Symmetry: C2
């Protein structure tokens, strides 16, 4: 002994698995390597893609010397908030016409989820009620648990969702978990392109889900991270949110522009709030301002400026919808091709889930022991859950992946 | 029959944050003599925002570089930004940098850096999940300091004496007494330079006395550094206190903002610098910071951090930036000197050396609330009830009117 560090007992936090997987993919010398663990759009040449419309808008911003760097309002750039909420709800939304919608610019979809969770933990179902159950899908994006736990919720639960046998939605289990949820429980719902499985309810299934939630006063907290990106069409991909609005729900929707604009690193999100009346929006927003203030003070400008300009200009909007469909069509192509080649190899089991699923992520139905084969033997990198990113498939590796998967079903 | 009440029906309306209505009232005022001394950011002599020339230049270079992509940054942020930011605060020759016992977390402005640090301390400092460690802020401080530490879960927020109303300066004896009486391990939120809102800073000799009590009572320094370079034009002088604490062997946090010294307010550029006793703890601390960031904003934005990293890493841009910072610092120094000279030429009662002894864009003038009300209502000069002014609200054109009006308030009111 000779003063002790105030950090002497701080533990090393747990190694998250996906980041070491992409690291292990990079260490691999094998020239057959394929990374199906990526979590962002990639071209047929395995490259990131800045959207043409984004490049165009970035040039217009750079050429506009009148733009300053003064703080945005706490709740964000007004034109961005309006355009983002209109994108989710539709231009002609009655909720917008009736002035009962609010929008809070946020730091990606994550920031929107966090602001909403903080609000609910303080002002929903009582004051400072940390006991309201929060239900997330089984499985879901793992940061869902972390966000709601950090907001103080003590009772995080899951609803049945992925059926490992049918390779699809366990609707009966989901409905039963809704029926058994205490009234006023919060449900975190993927608006489309469920992450990580890719399996979405059909509109008819959504109507059954909404019916139970309406009867039991369950709160819909939608996450919309893939609007337009998922199917190629922004209107189709927002239908479930808009259906809940038309059924009279009050709800939150955490929107991300990370994927559909490719603006991952500019942290562009929006929390849309739908209430019964305009006065409630004013009071809710006043509390969300306090929450934002003590978290990031006010939000950054560059990404929200890009989105606002694109969505406000019909010519740019049309160009953007084309760029979005290009991404969705490449994914739809990889799904169609993978299924066709797996069926051409006569691979055991059914494979229609590969094309029934929606978005960039797919639960393939492979088991962990089959996963380790693809990694160790064939250098195809994917998660133990069997999740793949379809953007890791290309015209050049599709045959290798499909044959390796066929070997990974018949031999292992 | 009756529609159910909204699930939001009992949510109260929050009450506004004071200065926003003041600015709104200024904007609606028809009088051509009106002056906004309540502004919270740098303004030119023509009352305008100023994008720094070096920032415009780097933005053009970024826009012309098609190789840059938009893929997620690491959770902790852009590596070159974090290294450059911590080196700016600590100095290239810092013993802590040489010994590899420094971490840096890119954050959403200085506010985000304060919040990440507060969340970490509320989980891992002075025990596990100890929400009872006292957190001390200056009397007065930026009110969002209290809100950040309260939201991180600290239940015992206290203040240390700081502004002396009678002397128009630092209450050193009160500050030292509050340090001496603070429970061991209490956290002190310290303004590294250009105290906000008063402009009153300890001298180096006073900082040595403050540090001596903190060392002896094991009090944790959580510095804010929002005005480095902006305050004096001299980056080393403006970081002297942080560097002195490092030299004295403290572990500390430093929440840095680039909102003011780069004028990058709306790009939300900050960095939390961590100084630890031993290099091996930095990896452990940063691993916990990663978890905190992940559930807050996931990962930080690129644009502003790229601008700062490019400027600080290139000799030619760095030199241009230091000149741009000096331009801002010198304008504020000029407004302070000119205001003091006019108040003394008018033989205004009281002492006015605090107008030039204070540092940075904010000044506690010493005017009382009734005098402030006179300035707003009678003279259309807008400032806060505390008597805080922003020196950037003064201009060559308005200085005579502002000084004359202050002289009127002092002699006629109260």
């Amino acid at each position: 002994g000779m003063p002790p560090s105030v950090f002497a007992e701080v533990p090393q936090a747990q190694p998250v698995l996906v980041f070491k997987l992409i690291a292990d993919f990079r260490e691999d010398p094998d020239p057959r390597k394929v990374n199906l663990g990526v979590g962002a759009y990639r071209t047929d040449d395995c490259q990131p893609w800045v959207l043409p419309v984004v490049r165009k808008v970035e040039q217009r911003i750079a050429n506009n010397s009148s733009l300053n760097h003064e703080y945005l309002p706490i709740l964000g750039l007004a034109e961005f908030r309006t355009c983002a909420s209109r994108l989710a709800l539709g231009d002609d939304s009655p909720a917008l016409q009736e002035k009962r919608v609010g929008g809070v610019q946020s730091l990606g979809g994550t920031g929107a989820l966090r602001i909403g969770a903080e609000f609910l933990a303080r002002w929903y179902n009582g004051t400072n009620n940390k006991d309201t159950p929060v239900y997330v899908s089984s499985p879901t994006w793992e940061n869902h648990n972390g966000v709601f736990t950090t907001a103080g919720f003590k009772d995080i639960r899951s609803y049945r969702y992925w059926d490992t046998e049918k390779r699809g939605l366990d609707l009966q289990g989901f409905l039963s978990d809704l029926e058994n949820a205490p009234e006023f429980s919060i449900f975190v719902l993927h608006a489309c392109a469920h992450n990580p499985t890719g399996t979405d309810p059909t509109p008819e299934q959504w109507k059954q889900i909404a019916s139970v939630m309406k009867r039991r006063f369950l709160f819909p907290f939608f996450t919309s991270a893939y609007q337009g990106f998922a199917s190629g069409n922004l209107e189709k991909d927002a239908w479930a949110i808009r259906y809940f609005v038309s059924e009279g729900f009050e709800l939150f929707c955490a929107q991300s522009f990370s994927k559909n604009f490719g603006l991952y690193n500019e942290r562009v999100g929006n929390l849309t709030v739908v209430a019964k009346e305009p006065d409630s929006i004013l009071r809710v927003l006043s509390q969300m301002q306090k929450i934002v203030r003590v978290t990031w003070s006010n939000p950054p400008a560059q990404g929200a400026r890009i989105v606002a300009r694109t969505l406000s200009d019909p010519e740019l909007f049309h160009e953007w919808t084309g760029n979005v469909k290009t991404m969705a069509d490449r994914i739809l192509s990889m799904r169609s091709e993978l299924r066709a080649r797996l069926e051409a190899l006569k691979t055991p089991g059914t494979w229609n889930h590969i094309t029934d699923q929606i978005g960039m992520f797919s639960f393939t139905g492979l088991n962990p022991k089959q996963v380790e084969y693809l990694i160790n033997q064939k250098h195809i990198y994917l998660l133990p859950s069997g999740r793949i990113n379809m953007c890791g498939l290309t015209t050049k590796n599709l045959d290798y992946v499909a044959t390796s998967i066929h070997e990974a079903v018949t031999k292992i």
